[PDB]
Amino acid sequence: SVIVYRNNQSTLTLNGYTFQHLYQGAALVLTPVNAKTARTNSINGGVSISGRVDGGVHTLAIMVQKHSPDDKFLNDAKNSQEPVVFDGSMKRAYTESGTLKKATTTLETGSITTQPTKTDNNQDPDDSRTYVIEFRNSVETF
């Protein structure tokens, strides 16, 4: 249908801190690690539907500037003595036809799960710190 967004990228904020230095070129990405329901399927038109406990478990890959307030926050999170839970939201504003709706996706208790692969070059500039915060519930609503 007809649709247009404000807010170029999904504005994002974890722990009441908003990410504002996002590496241009598809920084955020949400990946469902698992299915939403596994099934066992028996003879003659019979199946069994069971929503797994890993339903919303989503990994969020974030790309941030090599040394930025956003990378400072994520790094201080990474180096904490006790791994810091992450709660927050990814959301966009968008006007459906004329009506203004907001598409939000909560992000429950999550944590670091892959450190950035810290690469420094000389040929070419590279400021690409990619964290992956993988939560358990990522419910989009709209």
Binding site: N7, T11, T18, D87, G88, K101, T106, T141, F142
Partner: protein, 331 residues
């Protein structure tokens, strides 16, 4: 306790004005002592004579919240009826609870009966309790039983139907049991020879009002400390407005993951934003936060440095209080 008190021997209309000054005849201690004129220091000059404040009213409770930020209040004495609407309005405005007891005399649906007046007025923060003895102590064990909740654990929102209390129950017959149920009072009575506290729904449920009140105060405080102590002041950037929306959304999460609100259909008709998203979020997330757009706010209040008016909508989790079941015998 780290404070240095200096008090003249004379009492009454004697002034210790000086903030320790400086003597030309030595090396000062005043500056390092921290009681200089420039240095912040309280200096309560001696009063003239003994003072006799006139007897205030129980409405003078305004002072207490003025200095302590309590949330559940009492009174040793019984609150006289003429003061009941006043203290009820105070409870509604100053965002706290006030537990009060009454003897069987106030068991009616009459307007002259103050408690029924509270009910019809919607003064839901003025909780009314029953004691044939007029046992004021019954308020204590009541106040001491409602407020035990942490608002951060998994499931902690408690009702008070049938909760152990610390005062002897009394004896009632059926008719005033029902009357108390239908006029908002609460009853501490005997069931199967046991302490049994029963709440009512005429006035709003104790669980409901207490949960809502803690919720509103917690939203206010999370929003406040997001905004003045976080040391990174949040703008009117649309990202920043989204931040301020997420703060309250996160608190609402804390509460649905607490036991106060649960997802479900929305019974009411009034809403905001649009029916579809409203009911969808409530049926799924149990809450819905929609913040006014920066556009809809005039420049006149933008320079006032106040965000748009956020609108949050919640649905209580149902608490089982009754169970009715019917059993037949196939032989």
């Amino acid at each position: 306790n780290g404070y240095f008190k200096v008090t003249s021997s004379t009492t009454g209309a004697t002034s210790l004005l000086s903030y320790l000054g400086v003597a030309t005849s030595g090396t000062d201690i005043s500056a390092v002592l921290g009681m200089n004129s420039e240095s912040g220091a309280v200096l309560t000059q001696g009063t003239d004579q003994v003072v006799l404040p006139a007897e205030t009213k129980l409405e003078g409770i305004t002072a207490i919240k003025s200095e302590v930020n309590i949330k559940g209040a009492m009174f040793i004495d019984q609150i006289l009826d003429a003061d009941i609407p006043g203290i009820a309005s105070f409870a509604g405005a100053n965002n706290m609870l006030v537990y009060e007891v009454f003897d069987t005399g106030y068991l009616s649906k009459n307007v002259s009966n103050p408690v029924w007046a509270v009910k019809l007025a919607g003064q839901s923060n003025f909780r009314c309790l029953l004691s044939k003895s007029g046992n004021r102590k019954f308020a204590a064990t009541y106040m001491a039983r409602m407020h035990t909740v942490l608002f951060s654990g998994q499931n902690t929102a408690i009702t008070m139907q049938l909760k152990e209390l610390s005062v002897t129950a009394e004896e009632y017959t059926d008719t005033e049991i029902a009357n108390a149920k239908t006029v908002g009072l609460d009853l501490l009575t005997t069931i199967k020879n046991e302490q049994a506290l029963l709440t009512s729904g005429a006035n709003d449920f104790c669980d409901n009002v207490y949960n809502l009140e803690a919720f509103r105060d917690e939203i206010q405080t999370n929003n406040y400390n997001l905004l003045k102590t976080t040391s990174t002041k949040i703008p009117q950037t649309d990202p920043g407005m989204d931040t301020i929306e997420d703060d309250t959304e996160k608190t609402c999460e804390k509460y649905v993951r607490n036991g106060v609100f649960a997802p479900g259909t929305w019974t009411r008709s009034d809403f905001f934003g649009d029916r579809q998203q409203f009911v969808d979020a409530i049926a799924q997330k149990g809450y819905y936060v929609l913040i006014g757009d920066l556009a809809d706010q005039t420049t006149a209040e933008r320079q006032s440095r106040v965000s748009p008016v956020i609108q949050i909508a919640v649905k209580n989790a149902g608490a089982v209080h009754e169970e009715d079941i019917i059993i037949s015998v196939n032989l």
